[PDB]
Symmetry: D2
């Protein structure tokens, strides 16, 4: 898995389940092209977004729909979504884990990058 | 001062000085129009971005140029920038503090919303 | 003011008000002796803990009673309290800001060390 | 595994490897008794600290030696260690993951608690 997303809920101390995630890649004409999408599983993870062959050098954006997650729990949150933007694979193929920790008025995001 | 930004450096335990910040407002055509910008001061803060008159309800994006900050320190960072997207809502008098805590592979952002 | 504490609530996007803080200094017998204490103000800050005269080099512990704070809101929390342990070192003039960002199952703490 | 610890490095974007961890349990006489210890693996994880039979109700402290980790990388950090203190199993047996994200002047810690 070259790209995996993991989302945790800091209010409940649990994985964040059924969170929508959209990934985009910056195209030649400086616009964001849809690349992949999915929802987190019961473990708060999203696997299988892409393959090593498809995941070429580029600037990518991972957008996590945090607002819908909190609203479904009855909480009105601050952010519209969480976005993570990064250059990938520019010194060769790597594996990327993007982790997000969510609270209604705060989030953090961390990347773990490994060389296969 | 209804909107202020504070940026901290988690590697050095210091304010993040001279970081570029751009603020955008979402226009009816669903694109981002420039709204305000500046560089953080010696205390890592950016004040005087807008006034109560101009800061109407709407969707705002705050973009922090984190990549330039780490590159000046000689540290290779993960993210292209840090983006915070939120709705401003009239619901009594509101002041918004957007704080960001920066590491090379991780950031957190928190909103503090108070009423004078 | 060489030592100050700031506490934020990530669930409500507000200062964490009326939180008990205790400060201890490590004594030569390797036990913790009380040093200073207080409750955070309306802005979530605690000032006036000590003076430059008394704040000598040594190992200090700052204990934040997070559990009582969440229990007052009716939220069941994970941690018994939040503890920050550090060495104060004379190395030019130093002011220490210890910040904590609280969620029910997660906290972060950051030190900002500046020189007037 | 009733108790697992995972440690990440926010400066390098990698797991934090060979980090010493000590766990204690509060004894009848209000002192901290040693319970288990170990070091994180190449994946930044520490498994096998305890069993369900041994992991009874109590107040536990997980101490992570962050200072030694940073010093070995040539960085002088702020904190002496990171401590996580919590009541475990008081409403029946659960599984606990304690995660820590480390920077030299900041850390965060999150608990994920599941019902087996």
């Amino acid at each position: 898995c070259p790209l995996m997303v993991k989302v945790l809920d800091a209010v409940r101390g649990s994985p964040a389940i059924n969170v929508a995630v959209h990934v985009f890649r910056k195209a030649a004409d400086d616009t964001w092209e849809p690349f992949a999408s999915g929802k987190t599983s019961e473990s708060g993870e999203l696997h299988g977004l892409t393959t090593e062959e498809e995941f070429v050098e580029g600037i990518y954006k991972v957008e996590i729909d945090t607002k819908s997650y909190w609203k479904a729990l009855g909480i009105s949150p601050f952010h519209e979504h969480a976005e993570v933007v990064f250059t990938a694979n520019d010194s060769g193929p790597r594996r990327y884990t993007i982790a997000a920790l969510l609270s209604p008025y705060s989030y953090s995001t961390t990347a773990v990058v490994t060389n296969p």
